[PDB]
Structures are given as structure tokens and as C-alpha cells.
Paper text:
Moreover, [name] employs Eisenia hydrolysis-enhancing protein ([name]) as an offense to protect akuBGL activity from phlorotannin inhibition by precipitating phlorotannin. To underpin the molecular mechanism of this digestive–defensive–offensive system, we determined the structures of the apo and tannic acid (TNA, a phlorotannin analog) bound forms of [name], as well as the apo akuBGL. Combining docking analysis, we propose the mechanisms by which phlorotannin inhibits akuBGL by occupying the substrate-binding pocket, and [name] protects akuBGL against this inhibition by binding with phlorotannin to free the akuBGL pocket.
Considering the lack of known homologous proteins of [name], we determined the structure of [name] using the native-SAD method at a resolution of 1.15 Å, with an Rwork and Rfree of 0.18 and 0.19, respectively. The residues A21–V227 in purified [name] (1–20 aa were cleaved during maturation) were built, whereas two C-terminal residues were disordered. The structure of [name] consists of three PADs: PAD1 (N24–C79), PAD2 (I92–C146), and PAD3 (F164–C221), which are linked by two long loops, LL1 (Q80–N91) and LL2 (R147– G163), and arranged in a triangular shape. These three PADs share a similar structure, with a root-mean-squared difference (RMSD) of 1.065 Å over 46 Cα atoms and only ~20.3% sequence identity. Additionally, two small α-helices were appended to the N- and C-terminus in PAD1 and PAD3 but not in PAD2. The CNo1X15CNo2X5CNo3X9CNo4X12CNo5X5–9CNo6 motif (superscripts and subscripts indicate the cysteine number and number of residues between adjacent cysteines, respectively) in each PAD of [name] formed three disulfide bonds between the following pairs: CNo1–CNo3, CNo2–CNo6, and CNo4–CNo5. Such rich disulfide bonds may play a folding role in the structural formation of [name], with >70% of the backbone in a loop conformation.
Numbering used by the authors: 21 to 227
Amino acid sequence: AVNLCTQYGWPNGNYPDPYDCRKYISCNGAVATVMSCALGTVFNPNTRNCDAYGNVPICQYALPSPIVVTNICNQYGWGNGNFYHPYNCAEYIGCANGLTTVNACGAGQYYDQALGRCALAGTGYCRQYVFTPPPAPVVYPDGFDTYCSANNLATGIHPDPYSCFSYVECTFGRTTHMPCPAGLSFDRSLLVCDGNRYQNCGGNVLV
């Protein structure tokens, strides 16, 4: 347990505990220590920190097995496809028109979110937990409503330069912005919310 940080080739920081979402793995000095969130809070996979219960509905903290992602596709509105499991590198999630399937990789395999499939241990893996969260809350400057017009942006979808969890929409010069579904982040190349926080939120820089 104490060696998970180096096992996966992880930077120091906070990572999910796959058994108890009231706890988390603190990688500090390349050593893993399981830590407890203060009562009233649970580990938010998207902030990499403890957070109020209501911000993490997939953590049913009073339950035996408090991690409950078996309705996550409906809970957060995830589109069709495969996604990382927010608490467990060795599992993944399939969404089919709102229906969730919780899947497991084969023995000794780990889910690779970039490839969308499982593989045996490598040298630097479980990368889907390696990312820089945006601020919470994301503070927008007064006047951000000018963004589309000031940048002469075409009608449609654009990155949100304040948060990798969000995107901008431009409509006849009018600006709106919208967070991706919780756990998803904005792919600036394909202009869609997806499961690749590592690629969209600076994890490649951290490693």
C-alpha cells in the first residue's frame, strides 16, 4: 500500500482510495499514506481533495462499500463510450444511452483511458488520476461575456480558457460557457467533453 505512488509512476499528490471514498491516498515524498477526510467531507475525484458530501454523489459515505458508480452515466449525463472509474485504476465504466456498466480489467491489468482498454502494468500508468484540477469555484472576470466577440470566434464550440473542465459556446457573437459533466474534461482538438483529464488538464506536464 505504501508503495502505490512509485508502483504507478505517480507524482506526489492526492489519489483516490479504491475501497473508501471517505479516504484518499496521499503521495508525499514518493510514499503513500492513506488519509481520512474530515467528517462531513469525502474525496472528490475531480478536485483531488476532500469536499462536501453533496459535491460527490458517487460517494455514499454511510454505506458498507461507499463508492457507488453504478448509476454514474445517468447521474452525471455521460455520453456513450468507455470511461475511467473515478476511484479504481483496475476498473472502468461503459455508458450506453444512460445505462451504466461497471467493468473490470483482467487480472493484473489496468485501465488506460487514452487507449480505452486494459493492459498489464507498464512504467508510468494509471495516468487518468494525474492532472491539475481547475480552481473551485472557477472565477471568471467581469466582462468575460465579450470573449467570443473580442476573439472574433466563429459560431459553435470553443475551449474555455479559464477551465479544462468547461467549454465556451459562441452564438452570433454572444458568449456562454458550460462545465462538462462531472469527471469529464474538454478535448481542445476534437471539441468534446471526454474522460481524458490527463491530456486535457495538464497531466502530461506533471509527468
